[PDB]
């Protein structure tokens, strides 16, 4: 038992990280087969981002303007192209540690692991959720761009995030591996900011189910609520309205525990209105919303 | 910026995990050079732990009673011995992915990463602290024993924990890699339990310094306290008394931020007495005590 914010083992992704240098800018790239993926802003100088014409900037560059270092070894760039906000550098060597992989675009509320990298080398791993405002609560410093977010299925790495920028409140925005930013954010110097960050209701309910699986049952009550009644409370306290689709994906956890989804909603509704009596659920004095229903099943049974 | 509970990249340790089977018991082992380390309880049946004489149990066994599987490959056990609560199985093949490594025993309050494993295969990674009651807040299921905890220096993996058992409150106890349990716990069926879990004061102060580095400064005040005055407040709210040694190791963070340690103690003292105004520090409504002063420096600057 016990329940922790748990990341995927990073070894498969560690073998894909390389360093990309263009001019005086150094960041990380993702080396899969004979292609290296990295943020396109690597071609900007300190004073190119004010009004960056990425097309003109890249047209001015050639292959020898891009340096790729894999550990101690220089990889020779033999081609380059741009796809949305991602630069694609063709190299003369296929990565011998290329994993089976997919490029996926996730929905808000879904989770993934981040391998934070500097100088093309792994530094740390942590678990993130794509917030409803399309930011993530990362930990990133100078040189971290090109770090990736991912999930693992069996032996297949699903890459879903590449890091580009930090917003004024210390949260972060990036793209999928096709270069399309999550949310309305862009790799330009405009007055961008994270909006209000709503609590992911279906994730909180999943975490409450995790608590029941772990023997924490004090918050359950014998009186059911309605979806409309629960949502009335959910708009206050800044929770996402619970949809029928969200009720649906909580089904497997409801069947496993014997607690009807609307009974758990009644429990959550009571917790919001009366507050937690300085009390812990899974050892936390707060409701956690960065576990999906699939995350709970994986950690509680699927890992075995 | 941003600050997250961050684990070390697990790839170096993933290559050391193997599966160990004895009788009907299957768990994980750590394969370094030509030795496999695993909990000695693997030699017990379901009804041997009531009064286990591990010496007699191991004397009855031979090499062919131990099966070690590294991925798809059986490793031949050619020797066996017991050191404290750890079994050491000599195999005929040295691990080709053996990292540079050390066996270390950590102090309470220090942190490490856990690679949770099942069937000798990595499942997830998360960050733990050795609690003052000598337990860790892990996430472990059946078959997880032999999962290890570690820190990484440069290229050297410092193994500090191997998982053995779960206590009634859903926390966990284990040994160092020499087989000596942390705390008063034993691999026997006695009425063991985690005691009161004290808050690691020096870690909370370190995290407050991390908040200042990240631009969170609202909790600072211009009035200093004394160590004795702070500790009077610290015994209430169940904080560890702050020692001069703890003040010492906060020195580098105090110099970096310009905030004297006793000024941060005054800030912490005010936070405990008046509570947090539903307010967030680093986006958390609570004080976090699972980051050491070295953890803060690593995440804020050292990773670059
Ligand atoms: C990439 N290495 C770097 C990562 C950030 C450094 C500080 N924390 C981070 O997460 N990102 C940047 O430097 C980007 C520009 C860039 C560079 C290389 C590749 C891709 C993108 N710039 C910023 O994140 C920037 N934010 C910013 O301008 O925010 C606005 C647009 C004003 C809302 C700064 C954090 C550097 C101020
Ligand atoms: C190892 N695979 C297993 C891991 C635990 C299963 C449930 N969560 C876990 O962390 N540990 C055990 O099964 C141990 C015995 C053992 C087996 C193999 C190697 C080493 C040790 N037993 C327990 O953890 C046990 N706790 C227990 O008896 O607690 C007392 C001693 C009564 C306080 C159980 C969790 C299985 C009840």
XYZ file of C-alpha atoms and ligand atoms in Angstrom:
682
model
C 0.000 0.000 0.000
C 0.905 3.685 0.094
C 0.348 6.109 -2.762
C 2.956 8.464 -4.230
C 3.390 10.740 -7.227
C 5.230 8.205 -9.372
C 7.106 8.747 -12.628
C 7.920 6.203 -15.290
C 11.444 4.746 -15.268
C 13.476 7.136 -17.395
C 16.155 4.826 -18.810
C 14.579 4.489 -22.255
C 14.413 8.275 -22.645
C 17.869 8.953 -21.168
C 19.378 7.176 -24.177
C 17.618 9.609 -26.538
C 18.904 12.904 -25.084
C 21.553 14.892 -26.974
C 22.890 18.450 -26.872
C 22.084 20.906 -29.679
C 24.090 24.104 -30.188
C 23.303 26.905 -32.636
C 25.306 30.100 -32.330
C 25.593 30.957 -28.642
C 22.460 28.957 -27.725
C 22.761 25.449 -26.270
C 19.803 23.255 -25.308
C 18.570 19.658 -25.523
C 17.425 17.554 -28.440
C 15.596 14.246 -28.750
C 17.520 11.745 -30.902
C 15.267 9.117 -32.514
C 16.482 7.076 -35.500
C 18.519 9.566 -37.607
C 16.536 12.678 -36.594
C 17.109 15.109 -33.718
C 14.115 17.143 -32.515
C 14.555 20.408 -30.619
C 12.769 23.758 -30.148
C 13.064 26.028 -33.168
C 13.941 29.019 -30.960
C 17.489 27.596 -30.818
C 18.157 29.520 -34.056
C 17.400 32.869 -32.369
C 19.997 35.170 -30.847
C 19.309 37.152 -27.679
C 17.733 39.893 -29.835
C 15.946 37.833 -32.509
C 12.869 36.913 -30.418
C 11.507 40.494 -30.363
C 9.926 39.949 -33.801
C 11.255 36.564 -34.949
C 10.694 35.556 -38.562
C 11.639 31.916 -38.063
C 11.388 31.202 -41.792
C 13.969 33.856 -42.693
C 16.171 32.882 -39.748
C 16.259 29.225 -40.808
C 16.718 30.026 -44.510
C 19.890 31.912 -43.539
C 21.282 28.833 -41.762
C 23.027 25.763 -43.158
C 23.745 22.280 -41.819
C 27.139 23.202 -40.356
C 25.471 25.898 -38.222
C 23.992 23.089 -36.072
C 26.200 21.120 -33.672
C 24.839 17.955 -32.046
C 26.760 16.226 -29.258
C 25.803 12.749 -28.020
C 27.879 12.304 -24.889
C 31.452 12.874 -26.063
C 30.654 12.330 -29.762
C 29.792 14.937 -32.381
C 26.950 13.895 -34.690
C 27.134 15.365 -38.188
C 24.012 17.250 -39.258
C 23.202 16.454 -42.898
C 19.780 18.087 -43.163
C 17.370 20.404 -41.419
C 13.696 21.341 -41.592
C 11.081 23.011 -39.411
C 7.681 21.609 -38.416
C 5.527 24.118 -36.503
C 7.685 25.154 -33.499
C 10.040 22.155 -33.679
C 13.301 21.937 -35.598
C 14.205 18.586 -37.157
C 17.911 17.904 -37.699
C 18.818 14.910 -39.844
C 22.085 13.304 -38.718
C 24.303 10.672 -40.321
C 23.962 8.158 -37.448
C 20.828 6.377 -36.282
C 20.504 6.250 -32.509
C 21.393 2.663 -31.493
C 19.236 3.084 -28.369
C 16.124 4.270 -30.220
C 13.133 2.787 -28.360
C 9.839 1.795 -29.849
C 7.974 5.085 -29.680
C 4.935 7.133 -30.653
C 4.263 10.868 -30.823
C 1.003 11.605 -29.005
C -0.902 14.760 -28.092
C -2.535 14.527 -24.665
C -5.700 16.157 -23.267
C -5.850 18.504 -20.271
C -5.957 16.530 -17.047
C -3.768 13.733 -18.397
C -0.402 13.047 -16.792
C 3.125 12.311 -17.973
C 6.697 12.067 -16.715
C 9.270 14.802 -17.398
C 12.984 14.079 -17.809
C 14.613 17.436 -17.103
C 17.907 17.718 -18.986
C 20.839 20.116 -19.240
C 23.723 19.960 -21.731
C 21.990 16.969 -23.305
C 22.264 15.005 -20.063
C 19.482 13.786 -17.747
C 19.224 15.614 -14.433
C 15.957 14.545 -12.810
C 12.540 13.004 -13.302
C 9.145 14.100 -12.006
C 5.460 13.606 -12.768
C 3.295 16.343 -14.287
C -0.304 16.859 -15.326
C -1.399 18.999 -18.242
C -3.404 21.641 -16.393
C -6.803 22.829 -17.668
C -5.081 26.125 -18.547
C -2.653 24.135 -20.765
C 0.417 24.752 -18.602
C 2.425 22.299 -16.527
C 3.944 22.789 -13.081
C 7.505 21.977 -14.062
C 10.948 22.660 -12.635
C 13.087 24.114 -15.430
C 16.129 26.399 -15.583
C 18.261 27.968 -18.298
C 19.270 25.342 -20.851
C 16.343 23.012 -20.083
C 14.487 23.516 -23.368
C 14.125 20.349 -25.385
C 13.510 18.266 -22.275
C 10.625 15.925 -23.014
C 7.545 14.535 -21.315
C 6.414 10.986 -21.924
C 4.385 7.958 -20.923
C 5.463 4.327 -21.298
C 3.276 1.466 -22.540
C 4.963 -1.933 -22.326
C 8.121 -1.148 -24.301
C 6.704 1.817 -26.277
C 7.564 5.380 -25.248
C 4.764 7.855 -26.001
C 6.356 11.301 -26.246
C 3.815 14.043 -25.541
C 5.716 17.170 -24.461
C 8.815 19.185 -25.322
C 9.723 22.144 -23.141
C 9.893 25.650 -24.615
C 9.124 28.433 -22.166
C 8.371 29.635 -18.654
C 5.431 31.919 -17.841
C 5.562 34.700 -15.215
C 4.008 32.608 -12.416
C 6.693 29.924 -12.627
C 4.687 27.475 -14.730
C 5.668 26.169 -18.126
C 4.421 25.799 -21.687
C 5.547 23.626 -24.552
C 4.624 21.646 -27.633
C 3.851 18.129 -28.655
C 6.530 16.440 -30.740
C 4.902 17.762 -33.917
C 5.736 21.280 -32.706
C 2.185 22.404 -31.886
C 1.982 24.289 -28.597
C -0.468 23.186 -25.945
C -2.924 26.007 -25.352
C -2.703 29.520 -26.792
C 1.016 29.926 -26.104
C 3.664 30.782 -28.708
C 7.460 30.994 -28.834
C 7.365 34.780 -29.115
C 7.767 37.689 -26.684
C 4.130 38.562 -26.067
C 2.278 39.171 -22.799
C 1.374 35.534 -22.239
C 0.315 34.206 -18.854
C -1.327 31.154 -17.355
C -5.011 31.673 -16.722
C -6.882 30.460 -13.683
C -5.862 26.869 -12.867
C -8.990 24.783 -12.271
C -8.938 21.656 -10.108
C -9.237 18.450 -12.152
C -12.358 16.973 -10.558
C -12.190 13.513 -12.134
C -8.595 13.216 -10.903
C -9.530 14.132 -7.320
C -12.260 11.484 -7.386
C -9.761 8.946 -8.740
C -7.394 9.807 -5.882
C -10.224 9.327 -3.372
C -10.747 5.876 -4.889
C -7.021 5.269 -4.417
C -7.497 6.209 -0.755
C -10.299 3.646 -0.377
C -8.135 0.956 -1.996
C -5.494 1.888 0.592
C -7.851 1.570 3.575
C -8.736 5.265 3.991
C -12.533 5.222 4.276
C -13.432 7.794 6.953
C -14.723 10.327 4.393
C -17.370 8.022 2.891
C -21.038 8.638 3.697
C -24.212 6.661 3.032
C -26.093 9.470 1.234
C -25.827 9.911 -2.528
C -25.887 13.196 -4.443
C -26.833 14.120 -8.000
C -24.477 15.267 -10.737
C -26.245 18.640 -10.841
C -26.151 18.980 -7.044
C -22.447 18.123 -6.956
C -21.607 20.556 -9.758
C -23.371 23.397 -7.925
C -20.771 22.900 -5.202
C -17.982 22.284 -7.730
C -18.241 25.701 -9.421
C -17.487 27.177 -6.038
C -14.047 26.028 -4.826
C -12.944 26.187 -8.509
C -13.497 22.550 -9.492
C -14.185 21.451 -13.043
C -17.848 20.527 -13.579
C -18.151 16.748 -13.603
C -19.288 15.449 -16.993
C -20.916 12.151 -17.888
C -17.683 11.208 -19.671
C -15.792 11.790 -16.413
C -18.310 9.643 -14.529
C -17.794 6.962 -17.185
C -14.013 6.709 -16.829
C -14.353 6.391 -13.046
C -16.417 3.239 -13.643
C -13.659 0.634 -13.231
C -12.551 2.134 -9.904
C -16.176 2.303 -8.743
C -16.692 -1.381 -9.556
C -13.431 -2.393 -7.868
C -14.205 -0.581 -4.598
C -17.987 -0.948 -4.479
C -18.395 2.824 -4.054
C -20.778 4.371 -6.571
C -19.384 7.398 -8.394
C -22.187 9.627 -7.113
C -21.491 8.376 -3.579
C -17.872 9.472 -3.982
C -19.169 12.792 -5.335
C -21.229 13.160 -2.161
C -18.078 12.440 -0.147
C -16.093 15.009 -2.139
C -18.919 17.542 -1.824
C -18.899 17.165 1.970
C -15.103 17.519 2.030
C -15.253 20.784 0.073
C -18.043 22.343 2.147
C -16.847 21.323 5.618
C -13.114 21.239 4.858
C -10.682 18.581 6.040
C -10.461 18.410 9.822
C -6.715 19.076 9.674
C -7.185 15.522 8.511
C -5.153 13.386 6.141
C -6.294 11.307 3.197
C -3.403 9.105 2.041
C -1.243 11.118 4.439
C -2.036 14.424 2.708
C -3.993 17.314 4.201
C -5.165 18.230 0.670
C -7.013 16.721 -2.227
C -4.651 15.774 -5.053
C -5.680 16.180 -8.694
C -2.571 14.987 -10.584
C -3.520 11.283 -10.757
C -5.757 10.036 -13.566
C -8.061 7.028 -13.092
C -5.577 5.005 -15.150
C -2.746 6.256 -12.923
C -4.527 4.915 -9.835
C -5.109 1.474 -11.366
C -1.505 1.291 -12.590
C 0.033 2.150 -9.211
C -2.423 0.061 -7.173
C -2.468 -3.090 -9.279
C -1.032 -2.774 -12.773
C 2.630 -2.420 -11.826
C 2.665 -5.972 -10.430
C 11.964 28.326 -11.904
C 9.372 26.070 -10.290
C 10.132 23.475 -7.639
C 9.054 19.823 -7.720
C 9.742 16.597 -5.858
C 12.393 15.325 -8.258
C 13.953 11.870 -8.479
C 17.269 10.914 -9.997
C 17.200 9.442 -13.514
C 16.742 5.718 -12.981
C 18.489 4.277 -16.045
C 21.666 3.257 -14.220
C 19.659 1.313 -11.631
C 17.214 -0.222 -14.131
C 20.125 -2.191 -15.595
C 20.840 -3.738 -12.177
C 17.381 -5.193 -11.432
C 16.831 -8.959 -11.665
C 14.194 -11.415 -10.452
C 14.966 -13.842 -7.610
C 12.822 -16.923 -6.961
C 13.110 -19.301 -4.010
C 10.367 -21.869 -3.567
C 7.038 -20.148 -4.175
C 8.445 -16.686 -3.347
C 9.459 -14.291 -6.132
C 10.905 -10.816 -5.564
C 13.621 -8.476 -6.850
C 17.385 -8.592 -6.583
C 20.153 -6.080 -7.223
C 22.767 -7.424 -9.663
C 26.191 -5.789 -9.236
C 29.327 -7.436 -10.653
C 28.791 -11.198 -10.065
C 26.656 -10.821 -6.912
C 22.876 -10.534 -6.543
C 21.542 -8.899 -3.365
C 18.005 -9.539 -2.128
C 16.071 -9.736 1.167
C 16.817 -12.888 3.134
C 13.101 -13.473 3.798
C 12.915 -14.899 0.253
C 13.935 -18.254 1.783
C 10.825 -18.325 4.010
C 7.576 -20.074 3.148
C 4.199 -18.611 4.092
C 4.523 -20.291 7.516
C 8.253 -19.877 8.224
C 8.112 -16.230 9.389
C 6.226 -17.058 12.621
C 9.529 -17.972 14.317
C 12.109 -17.900 11.509
C 15.550 -19.333 12.207
C 17.175 -17.872 9.107
C 20.436 -19.710 9.790
C 18.763 -23.132 9.774
C 16.595 -22.187 6.794
C 19.613 -21.164 4.709
C 21.727 -24.145 5.809
C 18.985 -26.396 4.402
C 19.201 -24.679 0.999
C 21.656 -25.169 -1.855
C 22.627 -23.116 -4.903
C 20.058 -24.738 -7.202
C 17.269 -23.656 -4.824
C 17.818 -20.060 -6.034
C 16.666 -18.986 -9.503
C 17.791 -15.620 -10.890
C 16.282 -14.241 -14.095
C 17.776 -11.219 -15.877
C 15.179 -10.333 -18.480
C 14.726 -13.547 -20.464
C 18.008 -15.108 -19.278
C 18.563 -17.455 -16.348
C 21.680 -16.647 -14.318
C 23.303 -19.648 -12.649
C 23.773 -19.285 -8.895
C 27.170 -20.682 -7.874
C 27.283 -19.510 -4.259
C 25.217 -18.033 -1.473
C 25.759 -16.316 1.868
C 23.825 -14.130 4.291
C 24.878 -10.739 5.670
C 22.499 -9.406 8.346
C 19.057 -9.354 6.640
C 20.406 -9.494 3.072
C 21.074 -12.606 1.014
C 24.051 -12.545 -1.354
C 23.870 -14.850 -4.378
C 27.058 -15.328 -6.377
C 26.335 -15.877 -10.078
C 28.544 -16.997 -12.955
C 28.071 -13.793 -15.003
C 29.159 -10.278 -14.100
C 26.541 -7.658 -14.895
C 27.768 -5.864 -18.052
C 25.786 -2.777 -16.988
C 27.261 -2.576 -13.481
C 27.615 1.142 -12.672
C 30.218 2.719 -10.484
C 28.565 2.412 -7.094
C 28.840 2.706 -3.323
C 26.839 1.236 -0.448
C 25.924 4.038 1.958
C 23.816 4.285 5.106
C 21.873 7.548 5.299
C 20.690 9.603 8.300
C 17.070 10.452 9.120
C 15.939 13.475 7.147
C 18.072 12.609 4.125
C 16.400 11.860 0.805
C 16.772 9.291 -1.959
C 15.027 7.986 -5.066
C 13.144 4.667 -5.081
C 12.889 2.458 -8.170
C 9.852 0.294 -7.451
C 10.176 -3.054 -9.229
C 8.087 -6.167 -9.829
C 9.241 -9.434 -11.424
C 12.721 -7.923 -11.618
C 11.468 -5.129 -13.868
C 11.266 -1.381 -13.165
C 7.760 -0.018 -12.670
C 8.107 3.525 -11.339
C 10.347 6.063 -9.656
C 9.633 8.450 -6.793
C 11.498 10.486 -4.190
C 11.514 9.572 -0.496
C 12.936 10.900 2.747
C 14.061 8.735 5.631
C 11.606 9.872 8.295
C 12.733 10.610 11.869
C 10.878 7.427 12.883
C 13.088 5.487 10.408
C 10.279 4.648 7.981
C 9.721 5.873 4.439
C 6.463 6.856 2.753
C 6.726 4.428 -0.135
C 4.318 2.867 -2.610
C 4.903 -0.895 -2.572
C 2.780 -3.959 -3.349
C 3.237 -7.722 -3.254
C 6.471 -8.693 -4.994
C 8.137 -5.294 -4.486
C 10.751 -6.441 -1.969
C 14.296 -5.972 -3.172
C 13.455 -2.654 -4.809
C 16.228 -0.218 -3.957
C 16.667 3.410 -2.983
C 19.616 5.417 -4.215
C 21.299 8.739 -4.865
C 23.528 9.567 -7.837
C 26.805 11.504 -7.697
C 28.291 12.214 -11.123
C 28.408 8.652 -12.463
C 28.418 6.881 -9.062
C 25.223 5.297 -7.729
C 25.007 5.378 -3.924
C 22.627 2.599 -2.880
C 21.100 3.306 0.531
C 17.855 1.318 0.811
C 16.406 -2.095 0.002
C 12.722 -2.702 0.631
C 11.597 -5.398 3.072
C 8.277 -4.715 4.760
C 5.147 -2.626 5.178
C 3.931 -1.388 8.571
C 0.238 -1.150 9.548
C -0.114 2.558 8.679
C 0.975 2.044 5.072
C 4.583 3.134 5.553
C 7.630 1.025 4.871
C 10.825 -0.256 6.462
C 13.978 -1.709 4.997
C 17.725 -2.123 5.220
C 20.863 -0.609 3.848
C 22.720 -2.765 1.343
C 24.688 -4.376 4.175
C 21.394 -5.808 5.455
C 21.055 -3.636 8.571
C 17.518 -2.351 9.067
C 16.907 1.348 9.513
C 15.390 1.893 12.940
C 14.221 -0.816 15.339
C 12.456 -2.878 12.675
C 13.132 -6.551 11.915
C 12.066 -9.078 9.278
C 9.959 -10.997 11.787
C 6.258 -11.110 12.696
C 6.247 -8.892 15.769
C 3.960 -5.993 16.689
C 6.040 -3.352 14.939
C 4.649 0.052 14.033
C 5.874 3.457 12.957
C 6.084 5.883 15.840
C 5.097 9.519 15.692
C 6.438 11.108 12.487
C 8.135 14.407 13.340
C 8.457 17.218 10.798
C 12.029 17.650 9.530
C 12.610 21.280 10.506
C 15.866 21.837 8.617
C 14.168 20.526 5.467
C 11.210 22.910 5.823
C 13.635 25.816 6.197
C 15.527 24.634 3.108
C 12.245 24.548 1.177
C 11.455 28.095 2.330
C 14.850 29.113 0.940
C 13.867 27.394 -2.308
C 10.713 29.531 -2.296
C 12.776 32.720 -1.928
C 15.048 31.651 -4.797
C 11.847 31.193 -6.818
C 10.480 34.667 -6.033
C 8.129 33.715 -3.174
C 8.974 36.261 -0.471
C 5.651 37.266 1.124
C 6.324 35.257 4.309
C 9.574 37.052 5.201
C 9.592 39.529 8.089
C 12.164 42.017 9.363
C 12.264 40.717 12.964
C 14.695 37.990 13.996
C 14.094 35.265 16.580
C 16.404 33.184 18.756
C 17.077 29.470 18.428
C 15.548 28.892 21.869
C 12.510 31.047 21.051
C 11.972 29.221 17.759
C 12.309 25.790 19.370
C 9.678 26.675 21.985
C 7.271 27.008 19.066
C 8.762 23.996 17.263
C 7.969 21.471 20.020
C 4.356 22.418 19.530
C 3.239 21.597 15.965
C 5.561 18.537 16.183
C 8.684 19.995 14.565
C 12.170 18.722 15.284
C 14.129 21.091 17.546
C 16.564 23.062 15.412
C 20.177 22.263 16.296
C 23.317 24.280 15.662
C 24.340 21.615 13.137
C 21.064 22.207 11.280
C 21.682 25.964 11.319
C 25.160 25.260 9.933
C 24.030 23.266 6.895
C 21.527 25.994 5.989
C 24.474 28.398 5.692
C 25.034 28.191 1.922
C 21.351 28.873 1.201
C 21.372 31.759 3.689
C 24.388 33.323 1.971
C 22.885 32.846 -1.496
C 19.562 34.506 -0.620
C 20.724 37.093 1.911
C 18.190 35.815 4.465
C 19.736 34.977 7.828
C 18.833 31.535 9.154
C 17.269 33.007 12.293
C 15.246 35.383 10.102
C 13.886 32.372 8.219
C 13.183 30.747 11.595
C 11.171 33.830 12.541
C 9.277 33.486 9.256
C 8.621 29.789 9.902
C 7.589 30.527 13.493
C 5.017 33.068 12.281
C 3.725 30.589 9.686
C 3.193 27.904 12.335
C 1.453 30.183 14.844
C -0.801 32.101 12.444
C -1.200 29.358 9.830
C -1.087 29.860 6.072
C -3.832 32.170 4.845
C -5.149 29.446 2.535
C -1.966 30.700 0.953
C 0.553 28.979 -1.283
C 4.320 28.833 -0.995
C 5.751 27.371 -4.214
C 2.153 26.577 -5.156
C 1.601 24.411 -2.065
C -0.757 25.178 0.809
C 1.600 23.258 3.141
C 5.170 23.306 4.295
C 7.202 20.530 2.675
C 9.917 18.695 4.610
C 11.207 16.159 2.048
C 13.882 18.401 0.476
C 17.331 18.621 2.057
C 19.464 21.773 1.756
C 21.561 19.914 -0.822
C 18.377 18.961 -2.692
C 17.410 22.632 -2.998
C 20.824 23.672 -4.334
C 20.864 20.767 -6.798
C 17.424 21.520 -8.251
C 17.876 25.307 -8.261
C 21.389 25.519 -9.666
C 23.384 22.295 -9.643
C 21.475 20.455 -12.364
C 22.631 22.999 -14.965
C 14.981 27.027 -22.661
N 16.162 26.551 -22.472
C 14.380 28.092 -21.763
C 13.815 27.471 -20.485
C 13.416 28.529 -19.457
C 14.565 29.235 -18.754
C 13.952 29.676 -17.436
N 12.968 28.626 -17.192
C 12.608 27.979 -18.296
O 11.740 27.093 -18.373
N 13.361 28.849 -22.471
C 13.572 30.102 -22.883
O 14.621 30.708 -22.683
C 12.427 30.759 -23.649
C 12.828 30.973 -25.112
C 13.268 29.689 -25.764
C 14.612 29.375 -25.884
C 15.010 28.185 -26.474
C 14.071 27.295 -26.938
C 12.735 27.587 -26.815
C 12.334 28.779 -26.233
N 12.012 32.007 -23.033
C 11.336 32.002 -21.873
O 10.906 30.976 -21.349
C 11.097 33.367 -21.224
N 9.686 33.614 -20.976
C 9.045 34.595 -21.634
O 9.573 35.321 -22.446
O 7.753 34.624 -21.259
C 6.760 35.514 -21.897
C 6.683 35.167 -23.368
C 7.181 36.953 -21.686
C 5.449 35.225 -21.202
C 11.974 33.594 -19.954
C 11.581 32.628 -18.833
C 13.451 33.378 -20.296
C 11.792 35.028 -19.450
C 7.926 -7.976 -0.317
N 7.761 -8.361 -1.533
C 6.768 -7.550 0.566
C 6.362 -6.106 0.271
C 5.057 -5.720 0.967
C 3.791 -6.327 0.383
C 2.711 -5.333 0.776
N 3.447 -4.073 0.785
C 4.759 -4.233 0.925
O 5.599 -3.322 1.031
N 7.099 -7.723 1.970
C 6.571 -8.708 2.703
O 5.764 -9.520 2.257
C 7.040 -8.793 4.153
C 7.878 -10.057 4.362
C 9.035 -10.126 3.398
C 8.954 -10.882 2.240
C 10.016 -10.931 1.351
C 11.163 -10.217 1.606
C 11.254 -9.453 2.743
C 10.196 -9.408 3.636
N 5.927 -8.745 5.084
C 5.256 -7.599 5.285
O 5.620 -6.517 4.829
C 3.998 -7.695 6.152
N 4.044 -6.786 7.285
C 4.098 -7.268 8.538
O 4.105 -8.447 8.808
O 4.152 -6.248 9.414
C 4.342 -6.458 10.866
C 5.663 -7.164 11.078
C 3.183 -7.271 11.401
C 4.363 -5.075 11.476
C 2.683 -7.551 5.325
C 2.559 -6.147 4.727
C 2.670 -8.575 4.186
C 1.474 -7.806 6.229
